[PDB]
Write a structure and sequence with these properties.
The structure is a homodimer. Chain A contains 4 helices and 9 strands. With 195 residues, chain A is an alpha+beta fold. Chain A has one domain. A 5-stranded antiparallel sheet of chain A has the order 1-2-9-5-3, sandwiched between helices. Chains A and B meet through α2 and α3 of A and α2 and α3 of B. Bound molecules: 6-(thiophen-2-ylmethoxy)phthalazine-1,4-dione. Chain B: Residues 2-198 form the PARP catalytic domain.
Amino acid sequence: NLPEHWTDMNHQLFCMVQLEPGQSEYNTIKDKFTRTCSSYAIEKIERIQNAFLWQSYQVKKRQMDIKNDHKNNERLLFHGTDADSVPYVNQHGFNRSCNAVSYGKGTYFAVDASYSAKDTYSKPDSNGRKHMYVVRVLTGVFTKGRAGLVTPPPKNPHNPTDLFDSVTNNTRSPKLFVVFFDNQAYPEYLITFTA
Amino acid sequence: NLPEHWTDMNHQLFCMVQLEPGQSEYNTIKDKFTRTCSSYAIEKIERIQNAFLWQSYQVKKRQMDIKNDHKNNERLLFHGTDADSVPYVNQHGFNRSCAGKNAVSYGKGTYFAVDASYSAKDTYSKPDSNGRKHMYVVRVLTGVFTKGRAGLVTPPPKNPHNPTDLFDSVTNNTRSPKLFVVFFDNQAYPEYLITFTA
Ligand SMILES: O=C1N=NC(=O)c2cc(OCc3cccs3)ccc21
């Protein structure tokens, strides 16, 4: 059930598609980035077409929509990484088993591109190029995190296996989210940029 | 896609079903266990009906079946655990982030045994305060595997010049496998829970 806006993949299951500057899709993703990163230089934006990762993510989304008895479980967030991790993320997505982890041992995603644009996250490569993903994240119902969590806390410790979907730094005004399970995050676009 | 011989769960997403001795389904599990654990006695065997874990597992199996083309990717293995872990595994499956270091480590992941005798060690199936020991029978997507190494946090690449094309799992010995380690969520479906005693 591959999305309409994907382009044909000649019966293959993985491809990175470079977006055409000035078209609707490129403009929308560029705007999300330049909202906080207007001083950077965008080299290119690529659409990640990973059939298997999409499949696994959409199953978790359908499950969370049933569990939570509503949609609104999804947010678009940013994730900066080093060049040597980009092939892994494109093919396999995010892995908690692979920086500060103050809110738990999961994968971190930022509300603002400016945060992911820090050199500690989007490490500039031997040519000055920096890499940041635009990510579909199943944040669902969330609570404040804490150091040492390996899963989100329970919603009520009377039922210890019924968990929050994610954690955050601040529930009223979140700036980061942490997810603790594979296929809770789909890397949708890769931005290559310089300072 | 739920299997047609499961009990009707009446819109519920999760149920444990107590099996009857003398049914083929009970007897095959009892025989698989007693092949190496004849000194122990089974209290009960429960079929685990977890709709969401099943869906996510069967998606991964279909993907590995496509990618590997005509491999037997699935093995039926054992996993001993403590009573405190049983409610989490029943609902959420096998989480590598909660796994202990194994006495012989072939990587940082969830361990599954070929022989029930391995899982029956008190180190894994810790007796509870009533002397009950707990062991899962698990469908595991072992896929294409190689000998593991203690450093691993994912299976190793098949080819060092293509680091993202991975083995599906690792083992202690490729010629005579006795354990498998998996490093990803929804690569193992907890199918039965054996409760047993000395
Ligand atoms: O874009 C990111 N890429 N990798 C990260 O590890 C990461 C981590 C991150 O917040 C980590 C914390 C800050 C304060 C306390 S905990 C934010 C963004 C990213």
